Amino acid sequence: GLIVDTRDVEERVHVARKTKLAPTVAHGVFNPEFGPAALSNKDPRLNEGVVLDEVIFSKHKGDTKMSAEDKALFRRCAADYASRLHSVLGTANAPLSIYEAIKGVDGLDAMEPDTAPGLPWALQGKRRGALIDFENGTVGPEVEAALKLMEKREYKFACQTFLKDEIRPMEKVRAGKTRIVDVLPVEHILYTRMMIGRFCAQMHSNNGPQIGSAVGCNPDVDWQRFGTHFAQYRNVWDVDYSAFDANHCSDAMNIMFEEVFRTEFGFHPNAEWILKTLVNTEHAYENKRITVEGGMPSGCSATSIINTILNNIYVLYALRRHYEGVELDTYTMISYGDDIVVASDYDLDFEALKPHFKSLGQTITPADKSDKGFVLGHSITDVTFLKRHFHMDYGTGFYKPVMASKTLEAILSFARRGTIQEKLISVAGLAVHSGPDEYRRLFEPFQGLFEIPSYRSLYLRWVNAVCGDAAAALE
RNA sequence: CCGGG
RNA sequence: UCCCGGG
């Protein structure tokens, strides 16, 4: 987005400063080129003379304005995808009750009861539990008063910027490219869930190529579904974006919201209104307040869904801007926010689409670094989706999500205090797909120290997970 | 609590 | 932080 104003200010929102991610015994063995993001501006691991506060917001390069003709084209694409979407999900998009929005429904998990509340509550020193009753599914006066302002479209808010405490490639650590998290007020999250929660629930439940969304999928089971779909196409592309979230233009966001969340598709009028409050935002980071036009706040309710929907419209838009007679049948895709796999029998030229995506403010590049440009004839077994390759399991003949051993090494190399046992169990569920020898090697550092699930036990669990009756081949 | 986006 | 998936 475009920074329009950055006045310094009285009140101060102090972040975090130091990581909770401490090295494990595995770190000494694998010595990964990965470490915790820089959270302090004076982190010695940083490159000298590189201030952390600058690079955080460098992603805000501007808010691409589109022509009348590009907007009408985009409107057509948004409406075309919307048609497909609401056809599959139905039109029961009436507001969720307060209770439902808090407690969730089938396809939509309940709100986190003790996550950050946002502004202005964090300046008062107050937790989510004080504002909202998560067991009961009810709200205090302050939230109800905010609820009332949103009804009448008079509600205004600020986003609380947090530095993301996570493992990053050391190049990005040293370059100070710590990701941020735009924390919205808990009431904003609540109302958004009220306005579009059922839609979201339906999306999650209906995940797959048809709606072009993997939000809600379970890679253990769904890799067989997705893998077999995409293997039917002659060409598959693995597309990377540069700062996807920041670079959604005001025009694209507004038109997408206008076409997808219409009252004629069952939504309350304020579905459109509440989503449109994400366009022009005020961000609070320490003593500064930054006003941004364009871009999606990473950490609002349904950020993943909104990004996924945009991804879908972008691909349609870019193809129709370059080629003639392009429809939704012309290709297939699945995305998860900025992450995307696209396939087609037509030999599309994604190199030629680069400028057409640029007209939206988005920079596409191939997922592999080498080979200067996009290439034809790539298959499903060459691409990364959700940091997972599609490899055929030779025991069952099903697709399994394989993570790169270097990534698993990095994950296993760091942990927060007193979680190591728990993390190992969780990560073993990722690592089983790398096969027995690699599984043994990844956990070898932890032997004698923690309980490591046997390879065999997780393999049988998985064989049941994918279908179930494949397990019931007792010969 | 862990992974992914 | 938001969702998603798994304990």
| DSSP per-residue codes, A315-353 | HHHHHHHHSSS--GGG-EEEEETTEEEEEESS---HHHH
- Residue A322 neighbours by CB distance under 10 Å: 17
- Please give the structure tokens belonging to residue A219: 């890679």
> What are the helix (H) ranges across A90-140?
98-103, 121-124, 128-131
Cα distances from A140 to residues A61, A133, A135, A155, A375, in angstroms, run 40, 8, 13, 17, 56
Which nucleotide minimizes the distance between its C1' and the CA of A215? C4
**CB distance under 7 Å to strand B: residues:** A 167, 303-304, 307, 336-339, 386-387, 407, 411, 414-416, 419, 422-423, 426-427, 430
Closest nucleotide C1' to the C-alpha of A110: C3
Deposited experimental method: X-ray
The matching CATH number, chosen from 3.30.70.270, 3.40.50.720, 2.70.50.30, 1.20.1250.20, for A208-248+303-403 is 3.30.70.270
Give which of A272, A275, A263, A261 is closest to A81, Cα–Cα. A261
Q: Where in chain A is the domain with CATH 1.20.960.20?
A: 404-475
A456 is in an annotated binding site: no
Closest C-alpha among A314, A169, A302, A175 to residue A241: A314
Cα distance between the two ends of chain A? 60
A299 closest-nt by C1' vs CA: C2
Using alpha carbons, select from A48, A49, A53, A60 the residue that is nearest to residue A2.
A60
Contacts of residue A124, Cβ cutoff 8 Å, sequence gap at least 6: none
Q: Which of residues 172-201 of A touch strand C (CB under 7 A)?
A: 181, 183-184, 186, 189, 193, 200
Residue at the smallest CA–C1' distance to nucleotide B4: A386
Cβ A426 to strand C below 7 Å: yes
Instruction: Check if residue A452 sits with its Cβ under 7 angstroms from strand C.
Output: no
Distance of CA A331 to CAs A40, A230, A260, A319, A325, Å? 45, 10, 21, 10, 12
Class of domain A404-475: mainly alpha
Give the bases of strand B that a protein CB approaches within 7 Å: 1-5
Pairwise CA distance, residues A170 & A172, whole Å:
5
In this structure, the number of other CB atoms found within 10 A of the CB of residue A100 comes to: 18
Alpha carbon distance A444, A35 (integer Å): 21
Residues of chain A with CATH 3.30.70.270: 208-248+303-403
CB A428 within 8 A of CB A183: no
Q: Is the CB of A164 under 7 A from strand C?
A: yes
Q: How far is the CA of A95 from the C1' of C1 (A)?
A: 23
SS3 A445: helix
Nucleotide with C1' nearest the A162 CA: C1
A240 is in an annotated binding site: yes
Nucleotide nearest to A465 (CA to C1'): C6
C-beta neighbour count of A342 within 10 angstroms: 25
